[PDB]
């Protein structure tokens, strides 16, 4: 599946590569991380993506689902005035239309599969066309940085996006001696953590380093919402009884576990540098002492968040990088393998307050 770069500020310089089945599609993740406020283009974007669910259907029926998603996206598009005017921006309004144009032709190509079957050799044409959607959106709200920092206003900051090529030397393997991975870093949402990583790439901090690999768990913590659009008449006002209950029909009643996944815990590959252990024991307690029962000591848990965390020690990470190429060869990384080099490929200008 998808592939990730995670970090904990105040605890910097050790950044974690997490990859595996539970990790969502890199490109989709970046698209949703763009600091744009345009419901119209998100509406075109939502289907187009659900097309992948449509392919989870067996038989010709999958196609009468993607045809559904395409006509959906296509329709909502004809509304290119809120996409075009409302949000397109300065110097990109031209390439933006270059993108809208290609999206329309691609949607027509997707349609041309009235040739029921051809369910392979044209379906992920879905990739092609979503890039054009990504492009529409990146061309939209530009202007770089939606907001700004707190106290770290003097540490490196990635006031944008940047790309990096990571060339790894993979040992003892017939079929592959080495691979190059492309990672995009998201400074719109992870200014501090992305800033630090590129800053360290610059001082060649990752070249010739060896890695450790292993398994960990990802608290892909909790996600979707509620509201549906299009205002009509009156139906609500009052909190009512949410107090005395055990609440509604198919929505609540006491916990429920059985496998780690059922508790929101998904297994993923975890690759780091190869280091040591450093401690700083404190906080607010008095719930300690003794023995009698517990313990063995293993498997790290990773809470995934947007930089919305503060001070002192442990628990929690912010997501800042996304592996967008050769994401399938990460599974071939073992302890002992070498990061030969990590070189910025684009976006270096977005780096402010560089130190190196």
Curated annotation (Swiss-Prot):
Signal sequence extent: none
Induction profile: Up-regulated by light. Down-regulated by dark.
Sequence ranges assigned to domain PPIase cyclophilin-type in this UniProt record: 168-356
Primary location class: plastid
GO cellular component: chloroplast; chloroplast stroma; chloroplast thylakoid; chloroplast thylakoid lumen; chloroplast thylakoid membrane; cytosol; thylakoid; thylakoid lumen
GO molecular function, a single term: peptidyl-prolyl cis-trans isomerase activity
Keyword Isomerase: yes
Keywords tagged on the record: Chloroplast, Isomerase, Plastid, Rotamase, Thylakoid, Transit peptide
Tissue expression profile of the protein: Ubiquitous. Lower levels of expression in roots.
Gene inactivation effect: Stunted growth and hypersensitivity to high light.
EC number: 5.2.1.8
Subcellular localization: Plastid, Chloroplast thylakoid lumen
Listed GO biological process terms: lateral root morphogenesis; photosystem II assembly; photosystem II stabilization
Keyword Chloroplast: yes
Domain of life of the source: Eukaryota
Catalytic activity: [protein]-peptidylproline (omega=180) = [protein]-peptidylproline (omega=0)
Described purpose of this protein according to its UniProt entry: Required for the assembly and stabilization of PSII, but has no PPIases activity.
Entry remark concerning the domains of this protein: The N-terminal helical domain blocks the interaction with the potential target PSII subunit chlorophyll protein 47 (CP47).
Name of the protein this chain belongs to: Peptidyl-prolyl cis-trans isomerase CYP38, chloroplastic
Gene: CYP38
